[PDB]
Design a protein around this ligand. Structure first.
Ligand code: 1UI
Ligand code: 1UI
Ligand code: PRO
Ligand code: PRO
Ligand code: CA
Ligand code: CA
Ligand code: CA
Ligand code: CA
Ligand code: CL
Ligand code: CL
Ligand code: CL
Ligand code: ZN
Ligand code: ZN
Lengths: 484, 488
């Protein structure tokens, strides 16, 4: 690892994700290989999230990757937004197809004709389905691994309800689960909010979001999204049922969709990584503890040291810690030290002949670098205690970043200065698309975009507050900033 | 309730079963099918088992891109020649014609192996053992069939690379026995392990091992899972090379395997065990193993007694869930008990637990086996034990019947005429076979006078080949007993 995170963030990022063996490049730009070290993080996210949505009554399924042109076009605003980056298959071999078929950029238009078939009466609702799959958004802008890619893995849940109230309830439940993914699994603090009219999902009624801050770049990124689609799709796909109270009155289902992608891993890298490499929160780390023999002497001594390393390995497995003993004669201890530091293993467990003589070992925390000498007696307990402290510590520092870099401004001048110091800003906002474009133009390296209207803003909007445009009154404190 | 009869028109019976059990929904693009939760849960049960098993072997999961460039796709000419006609090509994004067309993986050898070549620079970088759970596209213009032959399907594909032949050889057979376990232990489907003939092997591989299942209603066999030894054919083309100090200066090529299993599994499960009442789920993979159905009422039933029966149903739900049996209590007040009986029989739930008032105060219940229809009266106390005992017995029973089918419909013939007779009986035949591609073509066309295809060369044939035995063609000596039959 040669580039420094605070001097060239992009070269740093590329080096960190490849040398930690998370990502490999592919010969088709914007598509990245998820090697096991990254894929394991995705599997930990999947385990937690899939269990949580099962408790809500969501079931997993799998819908086709291809959508017909006429299904794709049924919801005019949705298709208008996605059509420029929809990839089209036009032949198999050299045989042109009867009609071009599209790869899903998102599955609303694949799933909802089926929903219309399945909703025959109000008894058939709710429908609550989720799929873990890949989607393709073939934009020609520059990709960035994890954060903005042409193919990505995600989960997308689609729910249909007989009542708007039940749908509005699920929207926030799912958003709170996304916040838990970031804050409890990834140790990343996020801000819950709603998108402005300009930024909301096309075809939806409103979009709720969690926003994460990457202080290295002073930029925010959306981490997960939970939309209320209302009746905009059900009226176009005829997901209908007869009103139970009133004979012959047809009603349209109320729908939500919600998504979360492997962008998570990238945010995790950008927030916690350092100049020694990846830093893994213990909750998602493939390997939580790596055991490494040091020193290295008698044949009996070397055999006894390896035996002690495996005593530690087994007693850690005894209490469900994910542990690897790296007992390779190939590489020196210092080499392995920096290799596993590069991969972000929370704890390095060092066992040398002297410490083993003294019935103790050394535990080295990846986040702070602190070396603790621990009696062998404590091993499982202490290490668990340390892993929890690492998780909290990561969260705490990132929270202090967010608190430091998210502030209120009530004037465009204050706004601009704070923005150019590398922070995100909550300003009073009129909500109009034209004024949002004006903000993006006059704050331009990029202009600031709206990130979200926070559920809980830093300050109370005072009666009669003007927007920063000055022309119209303010409707809400809105978090603005530069965005990935 | 089912209309079509399995023994009358298998195809319409199959479509009826897969839709009315809520496994499959049709899509407006032909050859692609929606896997509804009922089917997807079977796939996830197979996934749980197989993923744990290959983790014990050292395989790690990952995810490679869906797209492959033309350059990569052509590098192993046999493989690309075999797949080219059914590779789907993306040619534009929106209305922007792409500079270069890009292909969707029909299989990921040509996606993964350039990366493997980058990662292997020494013998210590081997072995590489990766697996992905993903979707692939084979866009063939023939008639698709849900689960069995589809244009897009879910699968797992594992790709491993080794410094030596011996370890690769070992993995081929290990994975094959895992597939045999998926079929025989999870899905209660008996299979025959064997090696594909030269004509039927994976193009560009060295040899292909296979498990074949028999569908007696059709009299046809089908490949259930596959495990290839690729040898060095792909590593020489993608330069997956390494140097070892044991052999100075010689760049050695990795020995590779790839192995795949798809949602075809579920189709075979349907074709083998389904009956004229609908699906039949082996308890090992059943989303719901026991459905509890209050069948003590109509809308005229008392408000108090309704509450009592619903509470007893929830009692059974809690007990069964407490000993991890997968249970649904269907307490929907809006459907009648007979509607629920039919619904869950259609979906193949192994045990129906009926709770009525008279039995509810004789402290008993009724258990109805989906495979045999037998009704049993059970004391309340035996609930969690009894029902487990029945589930086990259903699994065994399904497997036993299936094996008695296979044992009855797989026989030996030694000349072409017995072979033709037996084959038209709706059976599959082990014959002495020379192994040659021309002769396998001849067998296919003469037997159409569709024709029989080779299914596999059994590891364990029914009989031992005589010394000097000649093939059923007569022109060359037989080299092995080979399982032939009409095939899906
Ligand atoms: C908008 O200006 C850009 C600037 N710089 C680069 C690009 C760009 C370049 C590419 F080569 C390819 C693409 C296409 N991929 C994506 O747009 C994208 C979106 C998301 N998203 C969007 C919001 C969401 C959340 N939460 C939703 C749940 C889904 C979430 O995760 C995640 C990923 C991995 N990729 C964009 C575009
Ligand atoms: C061969 O003449 C035909 C006759 N009638 C119809 C077709 C046809 C029609 C289509 F519309 C689409 C397709 C393409 N899909 C498939 O070829 C296919 C193969 C497999 N395979 C192949 C063997 C394997 C095993 N074990 C390998 C692990 C992979 C396994 O599961 C599984 C599935 C679900 N689909 C074929 C073709
Ligand atoms: O693309 C999106 O944002 C929504 C959420 C998942 C499904 N569609
Ligand atoms: O398609 C096949 O048959 C092999 C096995 C999975 C990957 N390639
Ligand atoms: Ca767009
Ligand atoms: Ca109306
Ligand atoms: Ca001591
Ligand atoms: Ca072919
Ligand atoms: Cl077509
Ligand atoms: Cl609108
Ligand atoms: Cl909040
Ligand atoms: Zn304004
Ligand atoms: Zn012959």
């Amino acid at each position: 690892l040669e580039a420094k995170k605070e001097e060239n963030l992009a070269d740093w990022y590329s080096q960190v994700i490849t040398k930690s063996e998370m990502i490999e490049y592919h010969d088709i730009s914007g598509c990245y290989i998820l090697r096991p070290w990254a894929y394991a993080i995705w599997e930990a996210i999947k385990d937690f999230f899939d269990a949580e949505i099962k408790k809500l009554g969501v079931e997993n399924c799998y819908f086709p990757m291809f959508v017909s042109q006429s299904a794709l076009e049924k919801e005019k605003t949705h298709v208008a937004d996605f059509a420029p980056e929809v990839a089209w298959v036009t032949r198999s071999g050299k045989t042109e197809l009867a009609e071009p078929i599209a790869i899903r950029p998102t599955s609303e238009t694949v799933m909802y004709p089926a929903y219309a078939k399945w909703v025959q009466s109000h008894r058939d609702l709710p429908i609550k389905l989720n799929q873990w799959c890949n989607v393709v958004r073939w934009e020609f802008k520059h990709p960035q691994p994890f954060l903005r890619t042409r193919e990505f893995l995600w989960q997308e849940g689609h729910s249909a309800f007989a009542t708007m109230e039940e749908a509005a309830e699920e929207v926030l439940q799912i958003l709170d689960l996304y916040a838990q993914v970031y804050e409890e699994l990834l140790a990343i603090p996020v801000v819950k909010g709603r998108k402005t009219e300009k930024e909301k999902f096309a075809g939806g009624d409103y979009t709720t979001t969690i926003e994460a801050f990457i202080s290295a770049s002073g930029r925010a990124i959306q981490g997960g999204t939970s939309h209320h689609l209302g009746q905009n799709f059900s009226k176009m796909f005829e997901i209908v049922f007869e009103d139970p109270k009133i004979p012959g009155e047809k009603q349209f289902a109320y729908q939500n969709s919600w998504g979360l992608t492997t962008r998570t891993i990238g945010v995790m890298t950008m927030v916690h990584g350092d100049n020694m490499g990846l830093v893994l929160p213990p909750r998602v780390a493939c390997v939580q503890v790596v055991i490494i023999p040091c020193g290295i002497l008698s044949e009996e001594d070397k055999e006894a040291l390896i035996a002690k390393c495996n005593d530690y390995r087994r007693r850690l497995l005894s209490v469900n810690i994910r542990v690897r003993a790296d007992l390779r004669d190939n590489y020196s201890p210092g080499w392995k030290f920096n290799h596993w530091e590069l991969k972000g293993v929370p704890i390095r467990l060092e066992v040398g002949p002297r410490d083993m003589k003294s019935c103790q070992f050394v535990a080295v925390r990846r986040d702070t670098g602190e070396k603790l000498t621990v009696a062998e007696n404590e091993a499982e307990t202490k290490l668990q205690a340390i892993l929890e402290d690492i998780q909290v510590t990561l969260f705490t520092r990132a929270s202090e970043d967010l608190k430091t870099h998210m502030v209120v401004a009530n004037t465009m001048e204050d706004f601009q200065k704070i923005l150019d110091s590398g922070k995100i800003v909550q300003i009073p906002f009129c909500g109009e698309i034209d004024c949002e474009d004006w903000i993006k133009k006059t704050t331009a390296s990029m202009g600031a975009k709206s990130l979200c209207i926070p559920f809980k803003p830093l300050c109370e909007l005072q009666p009669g507050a003007k927007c920063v445009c000055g022309k119209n009154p303010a409707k809400y404190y809105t978090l603005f900033g530069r965005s990935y």
